Write a protein that binds this ligand. Structure first.
Ligand SMILES: CCCCCCCCCCCCCCCC(=O)O
Ligand SMILES: CCCCCCCCCCCCCCCC(=O)O
Ligand SMILES: Clc1nc(Br)nc2nc[nH]c12
Ligand SMILES: Clc1nc(Br)nc2nc[nH]c12
Lengths: 346, 346
């Protein structure tokens, strides 16, 4: 149905910029929105200032958004649960604080929307996969797309995809997350794996985009990096058993192109400094997502025997002090080739 | 073979920014490069100033690039011929001045590289199709990709695709156009139709990107326009009998994303003014490619029964004084839907 669903309550676990922006979206579709944040002192400040001064400065929270540090109070009564907890803290959160939450979700069959992105170092698994160790996969969906947080939080027109193996789950979440003024529009897809892969890999590729800028390259180069980089997302998705339908959509190409063009993002600045010859040690002052992700990504790639040329070279630049110009030359030493895309039509 | 081909002479018919930049690329692979330009007086100026002050100001031409107004002197001895003549002048050029050129090309089996982009109003055909009425299609290839002219002309890293129905033709052109310093890298593909469609449609979509900016929208919106717009290139390509393998490559997505992000381009400024409420008459002072293209594109789409939502609405805004906010609302009145991309992997 193209008819929107409104709820009494939503909970968002994760208080970053993205989680906060999504809570702003939900505030227009649910009467009450709770945002869980572990530090009580900081919870008080935020509720006082009516603004997430910690991670979304300059944005006034809707009056119906309340921050809390009490997990139980947070989810009680919620009819949709969002996870935006950083990958590295996800598992521990469920083990240490998810017992009742999990029981509640299972009992009430509450939809869960995974918004966290990355790769867990110990298992090489993606966020929805980790969460799926604790919550029934039939209840799980993934949100991904070109969605700069400030724009989303302020209601500037944004499109994203919602992925669920069962398209009917995604379609229902589409009705909850899409806004009445059409400022936040969701598109349904089955490709959960493609979404998670794109969401992690885009951060590594963004460092490369930075490198290209630091090397003195221009916008033609950035476009080429996006397009060739996209095939790496595609190939890794295939190897992971994903259907790949999100690769050339909002979650894949859409988000990748946006993320690689964010010149002020930390991924980009780190790549630019690396491209200018600065060693990673000097740069490291606040870890760029791409830095953290590059290592587990290479390990997963190696484990699955997937060649990811750009990502591999970016990993070398970041972790093995490889000179950026040497990496580029190595990349361009493969000789002349065909583009590597199959025909769509026969 | 990954081994480059060097030539004695190249000719480029068309003296615009792009043709001039491509002549700079060729100057590094051919001893002599002739650029044909119809106005003799302007030819003299350019050769004197050793700079295309007309369409590529600020760039010093290689000493081996010579401008000329003599078609016969231009192609004589050439071993590759590039066309960059504007769509609307292509047919007349062959009819009025191509007799001997055509005989020479046929006799010597000279490769022809089509770089012109657009749709001819009278026949609704694309540039390589028009040229193919005069030169044997086996000799024809198309060059397309994210390739801002200034960057190409100055040797800043650029990747493009070369398309030919027979992949072997494209592969040979790849050896001629790719540079020894790897600053200009070509990728082979069969999808000529996809390239021509993308190259024309991107200009219409760029006006829409402008409109979005003028409406107060942001980068999330631009990313969505690129991604949804790409499906229109895909569907039109299918209807035209193209194989579509270029759609998600450099010629399609790559060039589209670049072109839609060029905020200072005429397509973009025209869209932005339209988005700000200015009527097209007041704007029209130097036609933006997207304006010229929108009409023949809609006619071709209608003729083939292909729905192109964004392009259609852009045509309405440009040609039928439709209010941009009304167009947007109409576009968003389709209800909630699936993303519309097939799985890549089963
Ligand atoms: C970490 C290195 C980043 C440098 C970025 C270079 C700018 C874009 C390069 C795109 C060319 C793609 C090379 C493909 C070669 C291959 O498939 O092995
Ligand atoms: C000429 C209008 C341009 C306005 C541009 C709006 C910004 C991007 C909009 C993308 C949403 C895509 C709408 C798809 C709806 C449909 O498929 O009918
Ligand atoms: Cl230990 C820990 N857990 C969660 Br959940 N989130 C965090 N953010 C910082 N440290 C964190
Ligand atoms: Cl009439 C004509 N022919 C060619 Br070819 N190119 C042109 N450029 C402007 N007018 C032109």
């Amino acid at each position: 149905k193209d008819e929107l669903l409104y709820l009494n309550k939503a909970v968002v676990f994760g208080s970053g910029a993205f989680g906060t922006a999504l809570a702003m979206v939900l505030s227009k579709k649910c009467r009450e929105v709770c945002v869980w944040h572990m530090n009580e002192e900081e919870v008080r400040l935020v509720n006082e200032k009516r603004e997430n001064v910690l991670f979304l400065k300059g944005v006034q929270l809707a009056s119906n958004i309340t921050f809390t540090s009490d997990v139980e109070k947070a989810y009680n009564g919620a009819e949709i649960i969002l996870f935006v907890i950083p990958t590295q803290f996800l598992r521990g959160f469920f083990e240490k604080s998810g017992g009742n939450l999990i029981a509640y979700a299972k009992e009430k069959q509450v939809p869960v929307l995974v918004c966290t992105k990355g790769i867990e170092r110990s298992t090489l698994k993606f966020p929805a996969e980790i969460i799926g160790e604790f919550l029934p996969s039939p209840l799980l969906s993934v949100l991904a797309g070109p969605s700069f947080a400030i724009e989303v939080a302020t209601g500037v027109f944004t499109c994203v995809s919602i992925a669920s193996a069962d398209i009917n789950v995604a379609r229902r979440l589409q009705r909850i997350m899409s806004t009445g003024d059409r400022s936040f529009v969701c598109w349904a897809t089955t490709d959960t794996v493609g979404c998670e892969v794109a969401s992690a890999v885009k951060n590594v590729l963004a460092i490369g985009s930075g490198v290209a800028n630091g090397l003195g390259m221009g916008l033609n180069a950035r476009a080429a990096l996006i397009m060739r980089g996209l095939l790496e997302i595609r190939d890794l998705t295939a190897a992971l058993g994903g259907d790949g339908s999100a690769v050339f959509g909002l979650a894949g190409l859409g988000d990748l192109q946006l993320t690689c063009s964010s010149e002020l993002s930390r991924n980009f600045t780190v790549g630019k400094k690396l491209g200018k010859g600065l060693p990673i040690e000097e740069i490291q002052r606040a870890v760029a997502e791409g830095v953290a992700t590059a290592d587990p990504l290479m390990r997963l790639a190696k484990q699955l025997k997937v060649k990811m040329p750009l990502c591999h070279q970016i990993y070398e630049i970041v972790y093995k002090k490889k000179n950026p110009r040497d990496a580029l030359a190595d990349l361009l030493s493969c000789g002349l080739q065909d583009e590597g895309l199959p025909p769509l039509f026969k």
